[PDB]
Symmetry: C2
Subunit: 164 residues, 2 copies
């Protein structure tokens, strides 16, 4: 079933992109979100230890004890994001090992953040053929979120690192 699903999605059976609104729990401790979700982090049902801010602006949450890690990226078709895949995925893996909730976010919660979450999931996959796992994670996340790594340059970088 999941296989027929992947092949139909892969041949144009996708919905038009829609903006995510709510935070998504991706793993036990790793969450994916947009800017509003980051602003709402301190009051979230989840007790975040970390927020990974992938936007260009270095904001603060001065009334919170959250540690905000800033990795400034631009959502464009020219930026290398792959230079940070190894260190970001190692950091997210450590958050999961230590049960330290972390919110990975960008402005829209689609491209810079979606790409780091896709990299994390690919990095954690030791079981499945990378090509199949990539299609599965891509489409299942997109169906859940509404839009997920729409930026084709970011998708290309994920494919180069984890599939090719």
């Amino acid at each position: 079933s999941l296989y027929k699903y992947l092949l139909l999605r892969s041949t144009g059976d996708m919905h038009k992109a829609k903006s995510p609104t709510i935070m998504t729990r991706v793993t036990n401790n790793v969450y994916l979100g947009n800017y509003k979700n980051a602003m709402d982090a301190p009051s979230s049902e989840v007790k975040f230890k970390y927020v990974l801010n992938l936007t260009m602006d270095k904001y603060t949450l001065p009334n919170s004890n959250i540690n905000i890690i800033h990795i400034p990226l631009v959502d464009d078709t020219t930026t290398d994001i792959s230079k940070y895949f190894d260190d970001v995925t190692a950091f997210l893996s450590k958050c999961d090992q230590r049960n330290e909730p972390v919110l990975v976010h960008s402005a829209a919660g689609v491209n810079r953040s979606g790409a780091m979450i896709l990299a994390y999931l690919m990095s954690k996959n030791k079981e499945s053929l990378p090509m199949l796992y990539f299609l599965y994670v891509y489409h299942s996340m997109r169906d859940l979120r509404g839009a997920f790594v729409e930026n084709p340059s970011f998708k290309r970088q994920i494919i180069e690192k984890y599939v090719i």
Copy 2:
């Protein structure tokens, strides 16, 4: 390269569908076309022996010596088309063996005809992993034609027969 191509196409990097206009030579003797292409068959640069008419109407070309084979199908999401895959692909294979040009057509040259051409190409593949070959043929034909088996029920039937 062809691999990176497939994976980007498979994750939403496709163009909006556009109607095919000109006939496409798919193999040495097998061509894919719309209704206008069928009407223009007798005067074509190609000396067709056969036209496979997949539309519901049994037309004639009374001034031509073309043999018109009628397999009436509807382009809808309910029709089994798979019941004819074995006999159609065997017939197309025979046209290629005998160097007898054949035009496979529907009304739009996209769905009923595109699906029989995709089935033919899958049937002729003995070399490549079916999942990869399916994605390659699908996307390469769609890029060439503008639109190619957009009907998701027909795609599902191809996947069931030749991939699963």
